[PDB]
Structure 1
Amino acid sequence: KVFGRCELAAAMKRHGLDNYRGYSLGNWVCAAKFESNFNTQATNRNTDGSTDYGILQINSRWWCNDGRTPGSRNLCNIPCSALLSSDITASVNCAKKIVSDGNGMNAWVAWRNRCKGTDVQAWIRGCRL
Protein backbone atom coordinates (compact mmCIF):
# COMPACT_ATOMS: atom_id res chain seq x y z
CA LYS A 1 0.00 0.00 0.00
CA VAL A 2 1.23 3.49 -0.84
CA PHE A 3 -0.15 5.79 1.85
CA GLY A 4 -1.05 9.40 1.32
CA ARG A 5 0.90 11.83 3.51
CA CYS A 6 -2.00 12.80 5.80
CA GLU A 7 -3.39 9.25 5.62
CA LEU A 8 -0.14 7.91 7.08
CA ALA A 9 0.06 10.67 9.68
CA ALA A 10 -3.42 9.68 10.87
CA ALA A 11 -2.61 5.95 10.90
CA MET A 12 0.58 6.58 12.85
CA LYS A 13 -1.32 8.71 15.38
CA ARG A 14 -4.01 6.05 15.78
CA HIS A 15 -1.25 3.53 16.52
CA GLY A 16 0.29 5.78 19.21
CA LEU A 17 3.41 7.04 17.44
CA ASP A 18 2.62 10.72 17.90
CA ASN A 19 5.14 12.01 20.47
CA TYR A 20 6.34 8.45 21.17
CA ARG A 21 9.70 8.76 22.98
CA GLY A 22 9.26 12.49 22.49
CA TYR A 23 9.23 12.36 18.69
CA SER A 24 6.43 14.41 17.15
CA LEU A 25 4.27 12.97 14.39
CA GLY A 26 6.10 15.05 11.76
CA ASN A 27 9.34 13.26 12.57
CA TRP A 28 7.74 9.89 11.91
CA VAL A 29 6.11 11.00 8.66
CA CYS A 30 9.37 12.57 7.48
CA ALA A 31 11.27 9.37 8.26
CA ALA A 32 8.73 7.26 6.38
CA LYS A 33 8.86 9.61 3.39
CA PHE A 34 12.58 9.19 2.93
CA GLU A 35 12.80 5.54 3.98
CA SER A 36 9.97 4.24 1.75
CA ASN A 37 8.12 7.08 0.02
CA PHE A 38 5.15 5.87 2.12
CA ASN A 39 5.17 2.44 0.42
CA THR A 40 4.55 -0.46 2.83
CA GLN A 41 6.02 -2.91 0.30
CA ALA A 42 9.44 -1.20 0.05
CA THR A 43 12.46 -3.51 0.48
CA ASN A 44 16.15 -2.77 0.16
CA ARG A 45 19.15 -5.04 0.48
CA ASN A 46 22.04 -3.83 2.64
CA THR A 47 25.75 -4.37 1.92
CA ASP A 48 26.01 -6.88 4.77
CA GLY A 49 23.27 -9.10 3.30
CA SER A 50 20.52 -7.93 5.66
CA THR A 51 17.35 -6.38 4.20
CA ASP A 52 15.21 -3.36 5.20
CA TYR A 53 11.43 -3.78 5.12
CA GLY A 54 8.35 -1.58 5.00
CA ILE A 55 7.41 2.04 5.59
CA LEU A 56 10.25 2.57 8.06
CA GLN A 57 12.77 0.23 6.42
CA ILE A 58 13.30 -1.97 9.48
CA ASN A 59 16.38 -4.18 9.24
CA SER A 60 16.55 -7.97 9.46
CA ARG A 61 19.98 -7.79 11.20
CA TRP A 62 18.23 -7.10 14.52
CA TRP A 63 14.51 -6.67 14.29
CA CYS A 64 12.71 -9.26 12.21
CA ASN A 65 13.20 -12.74 10.76
CA ASP A 66 13.62 -13.25 7.01
CA GLY A 67 15.46 -16.59 7.13
CA ARG A 68 18.44 -15.25 5.14
CA THR A 69 20.38 -12.94 7.47
CA PRO A 70 23.11 -15.02 9.20
CA GLY A 71 23.80 -14.37 12.87
CA SER A 72 20.92 -11.90 13.00
CA ARG A 73 18.28 -11.46 15.68
CA ASN A 74 14.49 -11.04 15.60
CA LEU A 75 13.87 -8.62 18.48
CA CYS A 76 10.39 -7.61 17.31
CA ASN A 77 9.48 -11.32 17.11
CA ILE A 78 7.95 -11.08 13.65
CA PRO A 79 8.52 -12.29 10.14
CA CYS A 80 9.94 -9.44 8.09
CA SER A 81 7.05 -9.93 5.68
CA ALA A 82 4.73 -8.58 8.40
CA LEU A 83 6.44 -5.24 7.87
CA LEU A 84 5.14 -5.13 4.27
CA SER A 85 1.43 -5.30 5.16
CA SER A 86 -1.12 -2.62 4.27
CA ASP A 87 -1.83 -2.65 8.04
CA ILE A 88 1.01 -0.70 9.70
CA THR A 89 0.58 -2.25 13.19
CA ALA A 90 3.67 -4.49 12.97
CA SER A 91 5.86 -1.68 11.60
CA VAL A 92 4.68 0.72 14.30
CA ASN A 93 5.12 -1.75 17.18
CA CYS A 94 8.58 -2.63 15.98
CA ALA A 95 9.50 1.05 15.44
CA LYS A 96 8.54 1.70 19.07
CA LYS A 97 11.09 -0.89 20.18
CA ILE A 98 13.77 0.50 17.83
CA VAL A 99 13.32 4.12 18.91
CA SER A 100 13.59 2.98 22.55
CA ASP A 101 16.94 1.19 21.94
CA GLY A 102 19.11 4.12 23.12
CA ASN A 103 19.79 6.34 20.09
CA GLY A 104 16.26 7.56 19.48
CA MET A 105 15.42 8.23 15.86
CA ASN A 106 19.11 8.29 14.88
CA ALA A 107 18.58 4.55 14.33
CA TRP A 108 17.11 5.68 10.99
CA VAL A 109 20.08 7.15 9.17
CA ALA A 110 17.75 8.92 6.70
CA TRP A 111 15.96 10.57 9.61
CA ARG A 112 19.26 11.87 10.95
CA ASN A 113 20.40 13.05 7.53
CA ARG A 114 17.15 14.47 6.11
CA CYS A 115 14.67 15.13 8.93
CA LYS A 116 16.54 15.83 12.16
CA GLY A 117 16.55 19.54 12.98
CA THR A 118 14.27 20.50 10.06
CA ASP A 119 10.73 21.90 10.13
CA VAL A 120 9.20 18.43 10.45
CA GLN A 121 5.80 19.96 11.37
CA ALA A 122 5.42 20.67 7.63
CA TRP A 123 4.87 16.93 7.13
CA ILE A 124 1.53 17.05 8.98
CA ARG A 125 0.41 20.48 7.68
CA GLY A 126 -3.18 20.52 6.41
CA CYS A 127 -3.92 17.12 7.93
CA ARG A 128 -7.09 16.51 9.90
CA LEU A 129 -5.56 14.94 13.02
Structure 2
Amino acid sequence: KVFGRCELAAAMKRHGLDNYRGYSLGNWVCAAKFESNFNTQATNRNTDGSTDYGILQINSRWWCNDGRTPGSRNLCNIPCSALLSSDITASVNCAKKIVSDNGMNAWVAWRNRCKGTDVQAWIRGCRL
Protein backbone atom coordinates (compact mmCIF):
# COMPACT_ATOMS: atom_id res chain seq x y z
CA LYS A 1 0.00 0.00 0.00
CA VAL A 2 1.10 3.60 -0.75
CA PHE A 3 -0.72 5.58 1.93
CA GLY A 4 -1.99 9.15 1.52
CA ARG A 5 -0.81 11.71 4.05
CA CYS A 6 -3.84 12.03 6.35
CA GLU A 7 -4.54 8.32 6.03
CA LEU A 8 -1.12 7.44 7.46
CA ALA A 9 -1.27 10.19 10.09
CA ALA A 10 -4.54 8.72 11.39
CA ALA A 11 -3.12 5.21 11.35
CA MET A 12 -0.02 6.45 13.21
CA LYS A 13 -2.11 8.35 15.79
CA ARG A 14 -4.07 5.21 16.70
CA HIS A 15 -0.93 3.07 17.13
CA GLY A 16 0.21 5.69 19.62
CA LEU A 17 2.81 7.70 17.76
CA ASP A 18 1.43 11.26 18.18
CA ASN A 19 3.93 12.51 20.71
CA TYR A 20 5.91 9.35 21.29
CA ARG A 21 8.99 10.36 23.28
CA GLY A 22 8.28 14.01 22.45
CA TYR A 23 7.90 13.60 18.72
CA SER A 24 4.65 15.00 17.36
CA LEU A 25 2.80 13.08 14.68
CA GLY A 26 3.91 15.37 11.84
CA ASN A 27 7.48 14.25 12.45
CA TRP A 28 6.61 10.62 11.74
CA VAL A 29 4.48 11.47 8.72
CA CYS A 30 7.25 13.66 7.45
CA ALA A 31 9.85 10.90 8.03
CA ALA A 32 7.68 8.36 6.24
CA LYS A 33 7.33 10.61 3.19
CA PHE A 34 11.06 11.04 2.70
CA GLU A 35 12.07 7.62 3.89
CA SER A 36 9.54 5.72 1.77
CA ASN A 37 7.12 8.10 0.00
CA PHE A 38 4.36 6.36 2.03
CA ASN A 39 5.06 3.01 0.55
CA THR A 40 4.61 0.10 2.87
CA GLN A 41 6.58 -2.10 0.48
CA ALA A 42 9.73 0.04 -0.08
CA THR A 43 13.05 -1.68 0.43
CA ASN A 44 16.43 -0.09 -0.02
CA ARG A 45 19.80 -1.86 -0.26
CA ASN A 46 22.88 -0.53 1.63
CA THR A 47 26.66 -0.63 1.01
CA ASP A 48 27.10 -2.81 4.12
CA GLY A 49 24.72 -5.49 2.83
CA SER A 50 21.91 -4.26 5.14
CA THR A 51 18.43 -3.26 3.87
CA ASP A 52 15.86 -0.76 5.03
CA TYR A 53 12.29 -2.04 4.97
CA GLY A 54 8.82 -0.58 5.06
CA ILE A 55 7.14 2.74 5.49
CA LEU A 56 9.75 3.81 7.94
CA GLN A 57 12.74 2.07 6.28
CA ILE A 58 13.98 0.21 9.30
CA ASN A 59 17.43 -1.23 8.82
CA SER A 60 18.25 -4.96 9.08
CA ARG A 61 21.69 -4.37 10.62
CA TRP A 62 20.24 -3.55 14.05
CA TRP A 63 16.48 -3.90 14.02
CA CYS A 64 15.06 -6.86 12.15
CA ASN A 65 16.44 -10.10 10.72
CA ASP A 66 16.25 -10.72 6.97
CA GLY A 67 18.71 -13.61 7.04
CA ARG A 68 20.75 -11.85 4.40
CA THR A 69 22.78 -9.42 6.56
CA PRO A 70 25.87 -10.30 8.71
CA GLY A 71 26.02 -9.53 11.54
CA SER A 72 22.58 -8.07 12.36
CA ARG A 73 21.27 -7.63 15.92
CA ASN A 74 17.47 -8.03 15.47
CA LEU A 75 16.63 -5.67 18.30
CA CYS A 76 12.95 -5.36 17.37
CA ASN A 77 12.80 -9.14 17.29
CA ILE A 78 11.01 -9.70 14.04
CA PRO A 79 11.67 -10.66 10.55
CA CYS A 80 12.14 -7.66 8.26
CA SER A 81 9.45 -9.03 5.89
CA ALA A 82 6.99 -8.35 8.73
CA LEU A 83 7.76 -4.68 8.06
CA LEU A 84 6.56 -4.87 4.48
CA SER A 85 2.94 -5.52 5.43
CA SER A 86 0.11 -3.08 4.56
CA ASP A 87 -0.78 -2.76 8.27
CA ILE A 88 1.86 -0.56 9.89
CA THR A 89 1.67 -2.09 13.33
CA ALA A 90 5.06 -3.95 13.34
CA SER A 91 6.82 -0.88 11.94
CA VAL A 92 5.29 1.47 14.46
CA ASN A 93 6.11 -0.93 17.27
CA CYS A 94 9.65 -1.30 15.99
CA ALA A 95 9.91 2.48 15.64
CA LYS A 96 8.96 2.99 19.27
CA LYS A 97 11.93 0.74 20.15
CA ILE A 98 14.35 2.72 17.94
CA VAL A 99 13.48 6.10 19.54
CA SER A 100 13.55 4.57 23.00
CA ASP A 101 17.18 3.48 22.05
CA ASN A 102 19.28 9.50 20.19
CA GLY A 103 15.63 10.30 19.28
CA MET A 104 14.68 10.45 15.60
CA ASN A 105 18.31 10.91 14.59
CA ALA A 106 18.18 7.24 13.53
CA TRP A 107 16.21 8.33 10.40
CA VAL A 108 18.61 10.14 8.09
CA ALA A 109 15.88 11.52 5.80
CA TRP A 110 14.11 12.93 8.91
CA ARG A 111 17.04 14.98 10.17
CA ASN A 112 17.99 15.86 6.54
CA ARG A 113 14.53 16.86 5.34
CA CYS A 114 12.10 17.29 8.36
CA LYS A 115 13.89 18.39 11.52
CA GLY A 116 13.84 22.14 11.66
CA THR A 117 10.68 22.56 9.59
CA ASP A 118 7.18 23.31 10.78
CA VAL A 119 6.42 19.58 11.03
CA GLN A 120 2.87 20.20 12.10
CA ALA A 121 2.07 21.29 8.58
CA TRP A 122 2.27 17.60 7.69
CA ILE A 123 -0.91 16.75 9.58
CA ARG A 124 -2.84 20.04 8.93
CA GLY A 125 -6.17 19.40 7.17
CA CYS A 126 -6.72 15.92 8.53
CA ARG A 127 -9.50 14.53 10.76
CA LEU A 128 -7.51 12.83 13.55
Question: What do the CA deviations read for 1:6-61 (whole angstroms, capped 9, x no partner)?
Answer: 00000000000000000000000000000000000000001100000000000000
Deviation, structure 1 residue 106: 0.6
Q: Unaligned stretches of 5+ in structure 1? A: none
Structure 2 CA distance, aligned partners of 1:26 and 1:48?
30
Local SS of the residue matching 2:110: helix
Deviation, structure 1 residue 4: 0.8
1:27-38 residue pairs with structure 2 within 5 A?
27-38=27-38
Deviating above 4 A after TM superposition, structure 1's stretches of 4 or more consecutive aligned residues are none
Structure 2 CA distance, aligned partners of 1:97 and 1:69?
20
Give the number of equivalent residue pairs.
Answer: 128
Q: Unaligned stretches of 5+ in structure 2? A: none
Deviation, structure 1 residue 63: 0.3
CA RMSD, 1 decimal = 0.5
Local SS of the residue matching 1:44: strand
Deviation, structure 1 residue 100: 1.1
Question: What do the CA deviations read for 1:37-90 (whole angstroms, capped 9, x no partner)?
Answer: 000000000110000000000000000010010111111110100100001000
Alignment TM-score, normalising by the size of structure 2: 0.99
Structure 2 CA distance, aligned partners of 1:7 and 1:127?
8
Name the % identity.
100
Structure 1 CA distance, aligned partners of 2:71 and 2:90?
22
Show the counterpart of 1:11. 11
Local SS of the residue matching 1:17: coil
Local SS of the residue matching 2:44: strand
